[PDB]
Predict the structure of Furin.
Amino acid sequence: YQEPTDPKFPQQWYLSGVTQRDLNVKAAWAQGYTGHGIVVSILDDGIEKNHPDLAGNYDPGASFDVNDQDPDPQPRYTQMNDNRHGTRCAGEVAAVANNGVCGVGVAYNARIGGVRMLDGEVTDAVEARSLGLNPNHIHIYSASWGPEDDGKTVDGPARLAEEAFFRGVSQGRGGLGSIFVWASGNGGREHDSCNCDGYTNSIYTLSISSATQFGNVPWYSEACSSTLATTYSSGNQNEKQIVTTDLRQKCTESHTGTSASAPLAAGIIALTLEANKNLTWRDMQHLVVQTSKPAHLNANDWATNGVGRKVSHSYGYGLLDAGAMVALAQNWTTVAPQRKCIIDILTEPKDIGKRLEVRKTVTACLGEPNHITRLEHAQARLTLSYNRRGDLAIHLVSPMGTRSTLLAARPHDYSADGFNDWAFMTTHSWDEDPSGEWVLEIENTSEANNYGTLTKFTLVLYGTASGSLVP
Ligand SMILES: COC(=O)CC1CCN(Cc2cc(CN3CCC(CC(=O)OC)CC3)cc(-c3cc(Cl)cc(Cl)c3)c2)CC1
Ligand SMILES: *[C@@H]1O[C@H](CO)[C@@H](O)[C@H](O)[C@H]1NC(C)=O
Ligand SMILES: [Ca+2]
Ligand SMILES: [Ca+2]
Ligand SMILES: [Ca+2]
Ligand SMILES: [Cl-]
Ligand code: NA
Ligand code: NA
Ligand code: NA
Ligand code: NA
């Protein structure tokens, strides 16, 4: 195997490193996987399709302009280069290799397109028409953005967009399911908590956070239990950043944020899908859980879950490992059909006050076709009133003792509107048996005499009842 000759490939430290602080992408390339035959679409502000490092892989069938309602996602050029982000992300996935220009994509033989959707008013319909673009041609969608990362917003896909997610994972990709890769957010400095973003909090999105070059949680990171895994991105000014294609046929070394991590994950997922085109959307999440690596990622919340995997709310299961992903994909056995066990828990509304604990022992739909002994995602769908929402912290403890933070205190969130059946999601109990006692904790983290009521707590379990590995 001959590594890329591109002039900035040596600067793509998160691919080209020899110090073990990388995504182990060369190992996948050397196994023969480069993204050939895979189609990825960047949902963003457009894609410079004539970029000298993108044109060779550009796919009009992976592209659309839902802002101006036309097929051509060319960015709108402005003096401040506002609409450059999709071009940066496209190059992360699929910049052409060995062509003397900039660097390379993770999946440098994949086909790449973009949906121009962010350069205009983003409505439910705009979102739905983007997520649902050409779903039997595009394999993987990469989305780096969502509701405002101001640390006070609770929002997610409205009806058309949620319908697009279910159509995508159900009928997309020939019934194997569209793979939606999401950035978990850039709201770290606002103390944002990313389960309050319904896109990344969705089970249908494969959510990705960031690590700095030196292995730390970047200033912009949001912690939450819905995150699955991590890719490298930017950090402080002594740490390198992401090197990629840039608007106006240029090359940048200063692409940043969690919004730069999702495209790298989408590229690794493209290599993995080349290794096994039959992988379902759930198979892909299983591969990520099993192969991601905590080592050398620094966080104070690494915890071992009930099946012996380390998990963090900053990193999920750790750094993506492309070599391991493609290796495990090759002989992967398709997971059983997804079961869903609904457990409505409260017999009466519960005053929250300073602190509320709700304990419930469940059988996880024992005796039913939705009996789950092998958890995938779990949700606590909560309906509650509270006078100041951001003073709440919420935790969910599984029978195996895994404490998932569902909501951390958000100091800027002054809302008196509470949560209306908000489906806080955790990935941290993946592969655990969910039978037994679950504990919900709701706490007022402020000294204020805050008040409210929990009126609904629905525990929703997803998963299967066969095929477990030894912990
Ligand atoms: C009843 O109907 C409704 O309520 C319809 C609503 C429509 C808006 N929805 C949230 C939303 C917003 C934006 C726009 N904007 C926000 C600021 C951000 C930057 C930042 O946070 O700076 C601190 C940049 C994005 C975008 C995306 C988005 C993005 C991608 Cl890439 C894909 C998809 Cl599907 C959606 C989603 C909620 C539903
Ligand atoms: C894909 O997986 C399904 C489910 O296991 C199986 O029925 C089908 O034969 C597989 N197709 C290929 C091409 O491997
Ligand atoms: Ca256009
Ligand atoms: Ca190149
Ligand atoms: Ca956020
Ligand atoms: Cl469902
Ligand atoms: Na975001
Ligand atoms: Na997700
Ligand atoms: Na544990
Ligand atoms: Na149990």
Remarks:
- Helices lie at 13-16, 25-30, 85-94, 124-131, 159-171, 261-275, 281-291, 322-330.
